[PDB]
Amino acid sequence: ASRRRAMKSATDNADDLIKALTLAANRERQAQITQEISEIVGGANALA
Amino acid sequence: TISAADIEGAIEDYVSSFSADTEREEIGTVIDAGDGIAHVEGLPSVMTQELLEFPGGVLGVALNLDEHSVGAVILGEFEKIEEGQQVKRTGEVLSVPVGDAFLGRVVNPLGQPIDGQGDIAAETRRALELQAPSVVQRQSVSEPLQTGIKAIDAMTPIGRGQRQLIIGDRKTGKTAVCVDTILNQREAWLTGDPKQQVRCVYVAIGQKGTTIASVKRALEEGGAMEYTTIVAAPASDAAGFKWLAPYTGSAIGQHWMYNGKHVLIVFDDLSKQADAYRAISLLLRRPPGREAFPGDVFYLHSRLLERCAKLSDELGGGSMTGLPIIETKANDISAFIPTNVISITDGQCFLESDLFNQGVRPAINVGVSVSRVGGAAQIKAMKEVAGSLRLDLSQYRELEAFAAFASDLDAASKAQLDRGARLVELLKQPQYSPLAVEEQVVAIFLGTQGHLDSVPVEDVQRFESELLEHVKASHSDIFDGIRETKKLSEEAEEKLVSVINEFKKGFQASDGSSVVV
Amino acid sequence: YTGSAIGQHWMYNGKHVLIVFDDLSKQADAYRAISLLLRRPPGREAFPG
Amino acid sequence: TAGRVVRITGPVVDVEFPRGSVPELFNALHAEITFGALAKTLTLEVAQHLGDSLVRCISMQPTDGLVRGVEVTDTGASISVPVGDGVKGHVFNALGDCLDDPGYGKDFEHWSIHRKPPAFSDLEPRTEMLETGLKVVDLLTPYVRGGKIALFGGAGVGKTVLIQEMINRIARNFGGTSVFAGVGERTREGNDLWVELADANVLKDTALVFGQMDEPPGTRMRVALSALTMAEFFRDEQGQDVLLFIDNIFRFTQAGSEVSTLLGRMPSAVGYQPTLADEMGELQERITSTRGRSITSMQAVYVPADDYTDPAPATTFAHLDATTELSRAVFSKGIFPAVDPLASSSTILDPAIVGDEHYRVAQEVIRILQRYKDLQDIIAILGIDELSEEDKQLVNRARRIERFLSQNMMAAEQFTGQPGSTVPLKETIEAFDKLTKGEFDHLPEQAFFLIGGLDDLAKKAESL
Amino acid sequence: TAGRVVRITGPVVDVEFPRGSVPELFNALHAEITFGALAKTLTLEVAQHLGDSLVRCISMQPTDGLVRGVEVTDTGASISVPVGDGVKGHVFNALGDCLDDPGYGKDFEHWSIHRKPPAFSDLEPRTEMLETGLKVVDLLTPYVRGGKIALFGGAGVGKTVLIQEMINRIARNFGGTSVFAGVGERTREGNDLWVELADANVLKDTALVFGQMDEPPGTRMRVALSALTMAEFFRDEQGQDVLLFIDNIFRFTQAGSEVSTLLGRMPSAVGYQPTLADEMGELQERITSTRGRSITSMQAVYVPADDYTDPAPATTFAHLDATTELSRAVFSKGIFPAVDPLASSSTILDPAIVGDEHYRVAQEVIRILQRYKDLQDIIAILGIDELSEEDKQLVNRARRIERFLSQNMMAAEQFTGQPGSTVPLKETIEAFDKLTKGEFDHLPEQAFFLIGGLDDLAKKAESLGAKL
Ligand SMILES: Nc1ncnc2c1ncn2[C@@H]1O[C@H](COP(=O)(O)OP(=O)(O)OP(=O)(O)O)[C@@H](O)[C@H]1O
Ligand SMILES: Nc1ncnc2c1ncn2[C@@H]1O[C@H](COP(=O)(O)OP(=O)(O)O)[C@@H](O)[C@H]1O
Ligand SMILES: Nc1ncnc2c1ncn2[C@@H]1O[C@H](COP(=O)(O)OP(=O)(O)O)[C@@H](O)[C@H]1O
Ligand SMILES: [Mg+2]
Ligand SMILES: [Mg+2]
């Protein structure tokens, strides 16, 4: 019974960690797109 | 036995009929040049996308038109361009020759042969930018296009006129799937009936020449060069050629399609074409966007891929089926070009490196792969046998976590686990070996009717193959019935079941066990 | 570069030299500032090519 | 007074006009490509005034074959689409041209596609519920009249049948009409929708406007406004309730981003256009209830990278009033419509709006379904018998509830001879209240499949 | 009829010429730096015609000391390097000057370094195995004789050590000619290679062309072309098998990107030049074997920041018959060579070419390693004791297999003090067949670390207290 309870808790914690990591990964993905666009546009403006 | 008579006659006909009467020509001057882009003053009446001639027989395409000059993408031998050179306008937008003579030939994006087999007799010419069939010029995609790959033909079936994306990381088996499809079209070709024949166009963009040669050798070994054309834009070609190669292949396929033929065109691969177009746009100083791509890259791919259509009966009923290939990086299907092409196509086959390393070949991820045409592109027999495959595989993937706890699992869960393992083994297929629709139907029938339940997983593949051999040698009437009627009749089904049971009596598991009952 | 030249004078005279750059990231930032002020087009992280 | 093409850069065209004849912003200009192969009439949309009598425009059609200096004619007004009852039953593009019958509607009244939303004082200050007649939607995810409903669902989940059902219900129950806006429409899918609507006999009640994938970004940007203008005419001049379908709104956003990039604008976060929010607001605020009539919209929404914080879905969801998620899991069970009752949601499922009894019944249904979903794993692996007796009771009740959310749809009559059913909201509320209490747990499961209210339930129970 | 310098900015120089005297693209021009300390003759490669009789060029030497308005002379031709049997046994720079014997080779035939690739009809797929004696390479990434081989990896994962190992194993007993191209790499490494080849007696059969990372971007752009021109002469004229070594080919792309923005090109994604794929395609398509003329090319490809999705390595991947991908994770685990068995690939690793046994054993090894990679996180968190018995068996087998893929290399002795070893292909296949069946499961995993064949395994196991 204790193992069942502990494994349910571990699965819930893993789900929460997955959610948080996905949020952080999406933030990083958006930031990478924004920074890449920033560098590209800066180069274009410099060559303008 | 080469007689000089033919050479003399040809050259005499050339010289005698040679006339170069002067014609008024609009001419500009190269005002600057750099890395494949030439800016040319003059040519006031030049058209957008017009073809221009530079000295030494160099070709350019006018893309940027402004008051000061014209920006032109040089299609080759750019190092020959110089400031001050005279540029003539051809008065024609990009166009390519088209005809039946292109079958079995390797050409460059301009239709010029590069295989060294001589001239190509062109039936006519097609502009690369002719509009796609209109919304009211089409009919629903209903005819199957059998790739010969069980995973695709059962899970994500492709119909004639469909655009099915093949997307995945490098070395995941995409070119293999496309080449298998082209090879599978050989029996249909041998039928000789234009309603069944499929003409194949393989467009190679950015591949190294030896890779294109290997693909051509693979096609020849299977006899696919008889009905296949290759449009090649190797890595050494100018960015303009890489940008135009898909359109050249599409134009040839469109000439065939509008004449009532059915065409299969493979773009290997559109990511390289997008990169070449991005290079051209950046060199022309066009504004960049995400990933530095221009604002019309989605337009590029969408206009390319909407020419693949199933024409209405009024227009001859022809069709062109698109198999664009996309190379993802680290399986990032969220990248810009993969996102665009996924949004454009009617279905996706996602190939994965982890599946490939696990031995699942072709490494198609059935969970995420989809075909929006769906069962409309399947024959009745495949629809019947393959109905339960999707749910069975989903349940198997759900239950895989309990592989070692089969004893704890109830009867239904263990049965589902075993069935899913056997089905996954069934969907595996060796390279360069497409299967006829009847053989695929029989194999899926084995999988989904429980006839592999008694067979060990490690033997399933072998079993299937041997069984398919046995029938083909002794009970071909089953295959003939499936092929002619496109359905599995009850009498045929019971005969197949009896044959399966006898063969099981005859079959040997690799571990010395018995597969009977 | 000044430190490298001072060390090179000894190195070419048969001596053994040890040079410590503490630290090159700051020099890279200074060079980037110089290049940007000169309006040379930027690259990754706005660094010069 | 006619202009001339000066610069051509893909779909971006610069046009020079005489000093005192510069067109207004968003005016439609006409140019001619006379090359035989690509001969056509380009429609340019004035995007910027560059100064010195120069304007920058987005070509609605590919500019291949266009020559510098060709005459450009100003039409004096922005892109205008035909309006009236004549547009029903026909297919148009973003420019108002009829695709199934070229020249049709060229004489109708023409409305500019750029219009302001209703005046702030003319807006309805109180939200209202759109009684569709479908049990699942009415009970769990009620649709807001004059609101916005996101639609989520893969292939083979009944989305097309759901759209046909909504067309039927707006045409029959509300006496309204429907405008379908295919943004970034695949030509194959557009043709399929055309033929399907013609077969189902609902084409007569629908006006189709297609901005296809193979068109430059400008038409894909403006097709939504075109369809919205047709719907606005139906609402304001004909005094009709209108149901506007947008598919896909994300493709409208992406076309806007492409246009912004083409015009040289500096991209905003994640590469979207700086005016992403402004464009989305301009489009969405025109979909409202006003003067007793309303335009209700059901829009397919694509979420990049499944990232709901992405700027495109984030801006889109600032205007959505309800969400309907179609799940293949529900579809495989035979429950139609295949609406996922747990993933779907509505912002008006609040006692202050739908009433206390409605909210209580809906919450009870959601709780039962959630507990059933939780017990699903144990059922699947350990077996049903492994569960307790209360768990078995709740499993039976939840199975009956989930099968009762299925309904016999009007659009489904074309597949099965049986016609559709319209369950009044009060009947649905009381029926599901009784069901949650376990007053029908003894009935067979099949008795709850594809039926209307309680009378149909009893009739099918006697049939078994 | 001579030009004059107008603008100078880093390695890019603008030169104005009279009417009708504008040099053709890629032409080599000469300018003088007269300052005593930095006095020299700049070679400038014409890169662009800017209009108004102006040309933008890349300097092959540092431009420090260059003065505006100095005379610029046009040679009328591209950069040309000496060709012939005389280049063997000598060290050259990108411009064809002989470093170890200045003035040598000035009378040889000279070939322009800019050249079109072989015609497509002349191309011929190569499907012949090139046995190396390295277990991982021979088993999972078999190299192709006459094909294109690359070693991918981040900084300091063993690309250069493996290049030297393959020089030791392949070039030592090679009948034909060898060409080594040091492209934007360490001068110390170049000197070490020169001395090592001299001591091994391989130098007499080798032509070395060095453009080091201290050189300006133009030299790093053109040194690969120079070495490839020498190799192309050997392939097409002398008609003998050629071994071509390039380290590091990524430096060509990097120098191109360095000068791109100064050439006025709007940057592409990740800061690379817009023409990355086209230039790389030209250079790589020149590096190939034609029908009857074999070039076995081995290239070290640097992967920036260990990011295999970076556009440079991603574009390079398409140009290789075989790729051995070195992993930082494998390196940090102490496994040498740090080959990633799951990421590497070879086009000749199919049953038709290598045979059913080799293919089956390799696929089984890959499957076991993939499963172990899948289970690593679970083992890290919950421990091995929570795995099924079959999974425990697979984990032990996979650890032994991954250790056995490591090998003591001839070129690695300087780093470990252990002499290298060579394993025949048959022995490798047999040993990994035995491993995949669990026949060595009783031996400790440490017994499989940095050894050769099965005899070495038995000896090390005995030294560790176990019997094979
Ligand atoms: N069904 C299969 N069974 C076994 N091996 C296969 C199968 N399909 C492909 N392969 C092998 O997988 C490797 C990759 O195949 P392929 O070149 O077709 O993939 P790709 O994704 O197109 O590659 P690339 O990135 O080089 O373009 C090759 O060795 C091919 O032989
Ligand atoms: N209520 C229903 N009754 C009968 N069949 C249905 C019902 N809903 C959906 N279907 C079937 O499911 C399929 C769903 O396809 P479609 O309507 O195009 O939606 P999607 O685009 O999600 O596949 C249809 O072919 C239809 O026959
Ligand atoms: N086979 C090996 N055995 C032991 N150490 C090695 C081996 N290969 C590489 N190393 C270590 O890793 C370092 C990096 O190798 P090298 O190839 O010179 O760098 P890079 O991988 O950047 O080219 C070497 O200096 C050496 O110390
Ligand atoms: Mg491929
Ligand atoms: Mg190195």
PDB file of C-alpha atoms in Angstrom, chain B residues 381-447:
ATOM      1  CA  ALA B 381      -9.650  -5.339 -48.752  1.00  0.00           C
ATOM      2  CA  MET B 382      -7.035  -3.074 -47.166  1.00  0.00           C
ATOM      3  CA  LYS B 383      -9.788  -1.048 -45.501  1.00  0.00           C
ATOM      4  CA  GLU B 384     -11.258  -4.205 -43.968  1.00  0.00           C
ATOM      5  CA  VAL B 385      -7.992  -5.781 -42.805  1.00  0.00           C
ATOM      6  CA  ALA B 386      -6.366  -2.524 -41.657  1.00  0.00           C
ATOM      7  CA  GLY B 387      -9.370  -1.196 -39.731  1.00  0.00           C
ATOM      8  CA  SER B 388      -8.167  -2.301 -36.293  1.00  0.00           C
ATOM      9  CA  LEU B 389      -4.451  -1.588 -36.802  1.00  0.00           C
ATOM     10  CA  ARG B 390      -4.499   1.967 -35.441  1.00  0.00           C
ATOM     11  CA  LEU B 391      -6.327   1.219 -32.189  1.00  0.00           C
ATOM     12  CA  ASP B 392      -4.332  -1.975 -31.650  1.00  0.00           C
ATOM     13  CA  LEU B 393      -1.020  -0.142 -32.026  1.00  0.00           C
ATOM     14  CA  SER B 394      -2.157   2.710 -29.778  1.00  0.00           C
ATOM     15  CA  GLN B 395      -3.162   0.223 -27.079  1.00  0.00           C
ATOM     16  CA  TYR B 396       0.163  -1.573 -27.499  1.00  0.00           C
ATOM     17  CA  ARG B 397       2.095   1.661 -27.024  1.00  0.00           C
ATOM     18  CA  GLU B 398      -0.005   2.367 -23.933  1.00  0.00           C
ATOM     19  CA  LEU B 399       0.690  -1.100 -22.502  1.00  0.00           C
ATOM     20  CA  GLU B 400       4.397  -1.308 -23.397  1.00  0.00           C
ATOM     21  CA  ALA B 401       5.257  -0.029 -19.909  1.00  0.00           C
ATOM     22  CA  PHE B 402       3.956  -3.374 -18.575  1.00  0.00           C
ATOM     23  CA  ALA B 403       6.092  -5.602 -20.809  1.00  0.00           C
ATOM     24  CA  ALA B 404       7.675  -7.496 -17.902  1.00  0.00           C
ATOM     25  CA  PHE B 405       4.473  -7.621 -15.801  1.00  0.00           C
ATOM     26  CA  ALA B 406       2.442  -9.665 -18.292  1.00  0.00           C
ATOM     27  CA  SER B 407       1.540 -12.166 -15.563  1.00  0.00           C
ATOM     28  CA  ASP B 408       0.038  -9.395 -13.426  1.00  0.00           C
ATOM     29  CA  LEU B 409      -1.924  -8.034 -16.391  1.00  0.00           C
ATOM     30  CA  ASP B 410      -5.392  -9.424 -16.965  1.00  0.00           C
ATOM     31  CA  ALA B 411      -6.043 -11.598 -20.003  1.00  0.00           C
ATOM     32  CA  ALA B 412      -7.188  -8.757 -22.263  1.00  0.00           C
ATOM     33  CA  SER B 413      -4.147  -6.584 -21.546  1.00  0.00           C
ATOM     34  CA  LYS B 414      -1.694  -9.432 -22.155  1.00  0.00           C
ATOM     35  CA  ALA B 415      -3.462 -10.361 -25.391  1.00  0.00           C
ATOM     36  CA  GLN B 416      -3.286  -6.736 -26.532  1.00  0.00           C
ATOM     37  CA  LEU B 417       0.419  -6.573 -25.665  1.00  0.00           C
ATOM     38  CA  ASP B 418       1.233  -9.726 -27.632  1.00  0.00           C
ATOM     39  CA  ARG B 419      -0.905  -8.669 -30.595  1.00  0.00           C
ATOM     40  CA  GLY B 420       0.753  -5.259 -30.678  1.00  0.00           C
ATOM     41  CA  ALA B 421       4.242  -6.735 -30.551  1.00  0.00           C
ATOM     42  CA  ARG B 422       3.375  -9.046 -33.440  1.00  0.00           C
ATOM     43  CA  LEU B 423       1.820  -6.191 -35.435  1.00  0.00           C
ATOM     44  CA  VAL B 424       4.887  -3.991 -34.926  1.00  0.00           C
ATOM     45  CA  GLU B 425       7.021  -6.881 -36.161  1.00  0.00           C
ATOM     46  CA  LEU B 426       4.647  -7.231 -39.119  1.00  0.00           C
ATOM     47  CA  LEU B 427       4.967  -3.595 -40.203  1.00  0.00           C
ATOM     48  CA  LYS B 428       8.751  -3.981 -40.506  1.00  0.00           C
ATOM     49  CA  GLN B 429       9.934  -4.231 -44.105  1.00  0.00           C
ATOM     50  CA  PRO B 430      13.341  -4.628 -45.795  1.00  0.00           C
ATOM     51  CA  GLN B 431      14.644  -1.942 -48.114  1.00  0.00           C
ATOM     52  CA  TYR B 432      14.127  -2.005 -51.894  1.00  0.00           C
ATOM     53  CA  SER B 433      11.347  -4.607 -51.480  1.00  0.00           C
ATOM     54  CA  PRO B 434       7.887  -3.118 -52.043  1.00  0.00           C
ATOM     55  CA  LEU B 435       4.917  -5.458 -51.726  1.00  0.00           C
ATOM     56  CA  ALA B 436       1.931  -5.750 -54.034  1.00  0.00           C
ATOM     57  CA  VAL B 437      -1.410  -4.678 -52.610  1.00  0.00           C
ATOM     58  CA  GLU B 438      -2.637  -8.280 -52.446  1.00  0.00           C
ATOM     59  CA  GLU B 439       0.462  -9.391 -50.527  1.00  0.00           C
ATOM     60  CA  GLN B 440       0.080  -6.449 -48.148  1.00  0.00           C
ATOM     61  CA  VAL B 441      -3.567  -7.401 -47.623  1.00  0.00           C
ATOM     62  CA  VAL B 442      -2.625 -10.995 -46.824  1.00  0.00           C
ATOM     63  CA  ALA B 443       0.143  -9.938 -44.422  1.00  0.00           C
ATOM     64  CA  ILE B 444      -2.128  -7.503 -42.583  1.00  0.00           C
ATOM     65  CA  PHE B 445      -4.779 -10.240 -42.513  1.00  0.00           C
ATOM     66  CA  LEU B 446      -2.257 -12.504 -40.794  1.00  0.00           C
ATOM     67  CA  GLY B 447      -1.493  -9.749 -38.306  1.00  0.00           C
TER      68      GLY B 447
END
